[PDB]
Design a protein around this ligand. Structure first.
Ligand SMILES: Nc1ncnc2c1ncn2[C@@H]1O[C@H](COP(=O)(O)CP(=O)(O)OP(=O)(O)O)[C@@H](O)[C@H]1O
Ligand SMILES: Nc1ncnc2c1ncn2[C@@H]1O[C@H](COP(=O)(O)CP(=O)(O)OP(=O)(O)O)[C@@H](O)[C@H]1O
Ligand SMILES: [Mg+2]
Ligand SMILES: [Mg+2]
Ligand SMILES: [Mg+2]
Ligand SMILES: [Mg+2]
Ligand SMILES: [Mg+2]
Ligand SMILES: [Mg+2]
Lengths: 559, 573
């Protein structure tokens, strides 16, 4: 019962030491709700609930709260600092650390044989590329988490690095029962796997007949409202000829000429239908190749503003409609779904968490659950920067030689980092919104270095870059600083002109504090404007401290 | 009550009462739209013709009445000179009427080898506008008439050294001088002094700017003389806007003040300029105009003519950082050229004589208020004479009838495709608004209002059934216009674009997508885009246009206004 689920979850969250607060409701059309819930003491811990009734949505918001604390997902994009990294356990007590080997292969106790073949077919994957982000603890080695391989009920250790880079928040769930949660999570796997096929393969799906939709009047109502509100809707059978329990529903916005495709899965057709609808841009396209691109599907996952083929909407479907149904008790539904995975010759790997007093699972199904492709462990690995962290956080206040600064630029180039990459994302820093690190990108950091190493020609290049691409999100203060610095750098290039002449004017336009700071920057003295120096427990960031305080509550719960 | 401000020859309250009355008598319903009093001692007002949206002015002054009198004075300035109608073709009836511009105008038929007819211009002007002697006569056809057969309309101007009449082609006046050096006033001389000062304002400005000059600050004890301005500046300064006040005389030569505002919030500056024989009036004029881009070290981009051309339209142009250098290139001069409007006129004219610059004035009294128009080639120019070849506002006059015929036209497909190539060969810019190129007051509620050359090329490619070109320009169209199209029209273009892209997919079956298209774009939009593709009805949203522009109600209101001026002119002669 929704009301039990809510009462229980609220209570348990409170007991755990979390002050949870309800930010903002919404009831856009009939039979559709959502709510935003937040940790009153950590801005970064928050969820979004959705359902066809108000309570359904609150229960969803709270359930996702336990899903994300149980799995540690809130903290998944952040380094947890040197103390936690060197503590008894980082992720879970039952985690397992595999030191790096002398030739840097992937240690033997990790993964299994099928996984090794899938993630690393060429056998070129090194061990040091699998260091989890949270610890960044190369000396301690590769953290691996336990997962029950389902065919033979044996434990398998999967590196947290792999889990987090390729599966992210996919196939996680929390529930009232072990099986309820697993059915939700396994369905979440079908949702996203089928979706990526329907989309990438530019499939035309078959409409759901009107007399079938009629069974679910509360959804029909939500659609008639959207349709009368000026938004054409398409409801589709995403089963691909009865195979998978997936509904797809697409909204058109004629005002902008764009479409928005939602997907949803559950063993019961009707639940799946509603799930897809409650979950409601770019126009459709005939670009067979741009739709299929991994970066398109990767977008669709983050937010659903991705490219959909016009082929989806073709009159003639590639599969017939099937009035499917896989329903029953959560226990039966779990077996029915698992049956499908067995039919596909796809090993399922589950991991159970009960340490917060609510059951929560995390489900990997390599070859289906993947959101990102394994090549990304080489090309787009979220701990690629872990080894520069200490160097970079030292820079504010640092007084190295000018060559050292200019080399770090060349290193960033040689290591192939993207200029647009946010530094706070690359190092796993919860900086909070009120300082320079919050908007600092690689390109800006290059400007800063060129200044500290006294190469004013490069400095200008990246200062221009910086403004071209950041100034719209800088604070007034900071944007002004950059305008001023830019002027002075341009003046430096004028060898005919006499800096003193312009000094009064500059002070009037930019303000004295800004001019004094931009000059310090140019003299290589204080190049790293607005960046405070950062200790290796991130005391410097109060945001990050609030993150760690939250994580302490989970560590204690784990013991 | 009677308020006599410096340099005017009549109390504000009289000037207002007179002007309002005279406007009414002329048959104009004038209405006051919106006042403003942003800082102390600075006002402005917007006045509008209740029956023509395009006829409107903006008044500015240091008191409320000063501003209203300004607004009204600029109203007579712009009716007297015909400037409201200067960007529009006036249709075939007016073009072939007794007189188009003024009764005393003069028409010079084109010659057999197409030289510029002999009664036009004089010798110094010919040397200035056309040093290479390559200017042809057919390039000088005024826009308003577009009447090549009737020839080059030329307006009379009293050359001032020897008091002789000189005929200047309306085309030249309008392309290079525009609204510069026009004025209206309470007296002949008041108006002329305002207008001649307007000339110095803009000439000196263009030197100060282009030559990246550092001006000398106006001393504080000098500013002190004009507390009402000082108050306006302190307010702007405390409001967060640094101000710089400058002597723009260039060492006492010219009666020009320059005042620059900084906006630290966006790191930009705004330079205002102003001229009047009396220092104090000039100061206030410069300040009130601050409220009716960042600086740069680019010596070359500041001087570029396109920069100074912007400054005139806009004041959002590039200023050199050099303006603000501590050390000035000229010393401050506590200048003064003042006296009675009669004396001030001579004093100013003295300066032009010193410069060896002929002044050409033209007087208008046919609306019951004196108004002048002053050309001073080599100083009054806003645009350079090279623009009579490259950027001539009647370059398109000869395609007008062809283009306005297109909606409803049923020519051969080759004819449509050629007109594209012609538009390319004649070197028109794709971004150019067609309604500006033909002089059409279309009003905001139809396809012509936003129609650019690039879109027209799309429309022609569709009518001439070249769907590959049609796509190129339909994409172009949306990339650069869709943000200003009406919902309806933007949607039509989204649909047309999809269908043109589908036409390129040789693997795909149009019928499959048909239901989906009808759902996204709507049936009307799909039916229209298909007609367009079949070359049947390509010119979407463009109604056909008769050669008196009855099709456009906006333009009709423009002509109804101009009738009132014609009758007034007839009366006077
Ligand atoms: N009574 C209840 N109602 C709804 N969800 C509940 C619930 N009890 C537990 N939950 C859990 O709360 C989580 C909320 O997610 P849901 O509302 O069911 C859609 P989701 O696809 O997981 O959201 P996502 O797109 O953000 O991933 C799920 O893991 C679900 O198992
Ligand atoms: N009594 C009066 N008070 C103020 N302006 C008057 C006036 N009588 C006539 N005018 C006229 O008002 C018209 C507009 O001039 P002003 O607005 O005061 C400066 P401007 O140089 O025309 O600015 P602008 O060219 O940027 O519009 C001029 O033709 C001016 O001579
Ligand atoms: Mg979920
Ligand atoms: Mg979902
Ligand atoms: Mg279909
Ligand atoms: Mg004027
Ligand atoms: Mg002015
Ligand atoms: Mg100066």
């Amino acid at each position: 019962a929704l009301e039990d689920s809510i009462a229980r979850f609220q209570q348990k969250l409170s007991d755990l030491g979390f002050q949870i607060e309800e930010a903002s409701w919404l009831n856009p059309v009939p039979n559709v709700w959502s709510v935003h819930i937040r940790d009153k003491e950590c801005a970064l811990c928050f969820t979004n609930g959705k359902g066809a009734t108000k309570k359904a949505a609150l229960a969803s918001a709270l359930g996702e709260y336990f899903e994300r604390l149980s799995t540690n997902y809130f903290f998944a994009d952040f380094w947890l600092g040197e103390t936690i990294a060197n503590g008894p356990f980082v992720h879970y007590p039952n985690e397992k650390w595999f030191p790096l080997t002398e030739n840097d292969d992937v240690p033997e106790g990790l993964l299994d044989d099928r996984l090794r073949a899938f993630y690393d077919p060429e056998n070129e994957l090194t061990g040091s590329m699998l260091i989890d982000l949270q610890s960044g603890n190369e000396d301690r080695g590769i953290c691996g988490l336990p997962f029950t391989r389902q065919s033979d009920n044996q434990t398998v250790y999967i590196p947290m690095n792999i889990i987090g880079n390729l599966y992210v928040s996919n196939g996680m769930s929390a529930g009232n029962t072990r099986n309820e949660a697993r059915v939700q999570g396994l369905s979440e796997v079908f949702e996203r796997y089928v979706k990526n096929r329907i989309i990438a393969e530019s499939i035309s799906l078959p409409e759901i007949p009107a007399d079938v939709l009629a069974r679910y009047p509360a959804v029909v109502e939500a659609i008639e409202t959207l349709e009368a509100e000026g938004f054409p809707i398409f409801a589709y059978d995403g089963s691909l000829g009865g195979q998978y329990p997936v509904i797809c529903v697409v909204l058109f916005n004629p005002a902008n000429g764009t479409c928005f495709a939602s997907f949803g899965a559950h063993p019961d057709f009707g639940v799946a239908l509603e799930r897809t609808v409650t979950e409601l841009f770019t126009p459709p396209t005939f670009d067979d190749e741009e739709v299929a691109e991994h970066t398109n599907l990767e977008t669709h996952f983050i937010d659903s503003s991705g490219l959909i083929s016009w082929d989806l909407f073709k009159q003639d479907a590639d599969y017939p409609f099937v009035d499917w149904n896989f329903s029953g008790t959560t226990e039966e539904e779990f077996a029915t779904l698992m049956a499908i995975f067995n039919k596909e010759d796809k090993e399922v790997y589950i991991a159970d968490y009960e340490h917060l007093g609510v059951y929560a699972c995390r489900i990997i199904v390599p070859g289906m659950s993947d959101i990102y492709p394994a090549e990304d462990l080489w090309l787009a690995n979220n701990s690629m920067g872990s080894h520069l962290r200490e160097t970079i956080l030292s820079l504010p206040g640092s007084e190295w030689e000018k060559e050292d600064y200019l080399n770090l630029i060349e290193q960033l180039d040689e290591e192939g980092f993207d200029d647009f990459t946010r530094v706070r994302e690359l190092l796993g820093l919860a900086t909070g919104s009120d300082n320079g690190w919050y908007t600092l990108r690689i390109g800006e950091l290059k400007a800063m270095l060129a200044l500290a190493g006294g190469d004013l020609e490069q400095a200008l290049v990246w200062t221009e870059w910086t403004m071209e691409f950041n100034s719209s999100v800088f604070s007034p203060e900071r944007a002004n600083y950059y305008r001023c610095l830019q002027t002075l750098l341009l003046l430096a290039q004028e060898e005919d002109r006499q800096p003193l002449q312009y000094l009064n004017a500059f002070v009037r336009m930019y303000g004295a504090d800004a001019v004094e700071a931009a000059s310090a920057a140019m003299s290589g003295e204080a190049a790293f404007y607005g960046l405070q120096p950062v200790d290796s427990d991130l005391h410097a960031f109060a945001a990050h401290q609030s993150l760690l305080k939250a994580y302490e509550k989970l560590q204690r719960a784990k013991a």
